[PDB]
Amino acid sequence: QCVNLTTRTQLPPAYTNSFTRGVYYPDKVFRSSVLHSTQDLFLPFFSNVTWFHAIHKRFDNPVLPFNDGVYFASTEKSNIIRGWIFGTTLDSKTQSLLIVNNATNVVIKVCEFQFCNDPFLGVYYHKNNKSWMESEFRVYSSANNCTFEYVSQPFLMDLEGKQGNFKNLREFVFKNIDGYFKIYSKHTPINLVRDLPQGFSALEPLVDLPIGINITRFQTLLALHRSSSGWTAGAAAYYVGYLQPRTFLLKYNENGTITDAVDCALDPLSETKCTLKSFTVEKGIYQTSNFRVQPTESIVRFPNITNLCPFGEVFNATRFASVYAWNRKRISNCVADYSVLYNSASFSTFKCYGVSPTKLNDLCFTNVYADSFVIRGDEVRQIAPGQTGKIADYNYKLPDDFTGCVIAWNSNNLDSKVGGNYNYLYRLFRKSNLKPFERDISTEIYQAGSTPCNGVEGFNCYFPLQSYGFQPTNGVGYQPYRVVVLSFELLHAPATVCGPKKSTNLVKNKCVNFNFNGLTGTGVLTESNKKFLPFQQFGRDIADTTDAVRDPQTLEILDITPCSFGGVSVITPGTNTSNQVAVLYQDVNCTEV
């Protein structure tokens, strides 16, 4: 268990080339004699993969980054690859996936594991009675809080040692997306000395494991042998490479099996194959696309401020204003973090009409006004663009173009007092339909008849303000809901309020992924002679995209120049002639290459 290995020899992390390896069926759909362009996580062709082995002084089962997904390939003889551990911190502090083979069953368990630094499975002491049977199970010390378990049917694996070339090739695509673990397995017989076999195999989906965990790291199990740290390692190898969101062409044959694939991102040649939608490129020149410069690092720049916005003075306030006259509090020069509102959590309905709530942390807003008042429970739906009701149709209206968030929660536990709470009124009778965001405090007597009311109540004369009955015993439809309507202009002005997203260092003269006052994009930041007026934040071009921003912390005007510039051509003879290509780069000198 806790016993580490001794004879392990330190060797440099050598690398290997995978030729077509990493291709799998993207879906369960059958396709025959077609060339299908797909976009998914794939191992790029001719990508640099990793060189690992088990041998009598090199034994390698290191922690490896999972990233978006990994491609596994192992040339095997004695079945030395027993499985994997998939997790984040690889400890009991988190939940980790364990896929192993204990020779009897295939054990897939998602548990909380006590994690050994060197997991393995041993085979012991053959001599007479050739054996080849397991003894110790070393992969984990303890497994608790198991949320998933899979135990396959009993089978007898052949564990006997082999010599010479590897007779088995086990290829696996490991990717975890949306708490959903996809495994793509392919097994083909091979004859190979070392490195990785040059060829093509289309990996097929094995199972789909609903593990639902985070997997930033993984290890591979291995087998140990000797004629408990003094064991040895049987001869084997395994190769790890990282999936990337690459576009492939997939050539299906008559049967349906994928014969060959083309990675569109290899070179300008393979991109021509993707545009032409054929593996045979005719002799000539083909325009592919411009020369794309991927952003080096993601840059975030927000207006520094250490104050949290008054979530206590707005949402936790003692008494809200009535709906007819509703308090409008300007929210400025603070950090808007709705994680604080979770400590004491209320909101019954949360609706952001102009934005998506998941972007409220990544995005921030210019002029924020908290529209706060109390209404009857059934009238909260009446707060929305285009609604009608004694709230919407009379006293409190929202714009048709309204960009903001509407927030409401039950005040019954507070605003309901004994026999009734009459401090919260509403406008029952209004002469017209007031424009959005308009407060009417006028108590003048409404005239429902033809006779002038002269400012006194009477027949067809009604005082415009009425009260809601508030009792803790009222139906939930009649129970008061506090409601806060957050209104903002967005991305078109300077933003004083910005959420709890820490700003990063500012990078110039390099392609980066930039975030300014919630505006995300990819471009090159450079100093400019543009001088924005004090009210101007983002500059824009003819294309209406943002040409220049203003650094919110220190005042400066940074031009945003789009990355991925200049034309690229492919000069090649027919692929039947040669695969050598000449790449003409228009609009450039010889620099990028």
Binding site: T275, K277, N290, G521, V524, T561, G566, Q586, D587, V588
Partner: protein
């Protein structure tokens, strides 16, 4: 570039455009078909003859002065005085089709058309035949018309 023009520098958008499929390919297939025939249009007009004819150094035309329509070696590109006027009366883009990224990045000309087109994925392909070569096709067709009469179009220049 119809991936670049539609979705600028954006992965989320480009993944949505790939659902539209052959639309991006069929637009460039038609634009390439234009780019090929425009080099073919120039090929059909200015080169009707395989041989490049030049006027002999000794000029006796019978009084006819062709020095205005004949190329001038004094200019960097050999051109007639009229072809020099024809090139100066038609305004084109910047000299040469190579515009550096640093030229657009290092200095942004306020409302600059050519850079803004290129950052939006609009690229101007250079013609297969330079104006220096076109001047040498018209020179060959003119030198044959002067010296050989009309016989150079029906066969060897006589």
């Amino acid at each position: 570039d119809c991936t670049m023009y539609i979705c600028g520098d954006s992965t989320e958008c480009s993944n949505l455009l790939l659902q539209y499929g052959s639309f991006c390919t069929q637009l460039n297939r038609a634009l390439t078909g234009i780019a090929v025939e425009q080099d073919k249009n120039t090929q059909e007009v200015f080169a009707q003859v395989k041989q490049i004819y030049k006027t002999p150094p000794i000029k006796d035309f019978g009084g006819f002065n062709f020095s205005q329509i004949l190329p001038d070696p004094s200019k960097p590109s050999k051109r007639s005085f009229i072809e020099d006027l024809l090139f100066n009366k038609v305004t084109l883009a910047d000299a040469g089709f190579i515009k550096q990224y640093g030229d657009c990045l290092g200095d942004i000309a306020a409302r600059d058309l050519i850079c803004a087109q290129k950052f939006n994925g609009l690229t101007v392909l250079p013609p297969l035949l330079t104006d220096e070569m076109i001047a040498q096709y018209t020179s060959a067709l003119l030198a044959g018309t002067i010296t050989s009469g009309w016989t150079f179009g029906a066969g060897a220049a006589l």
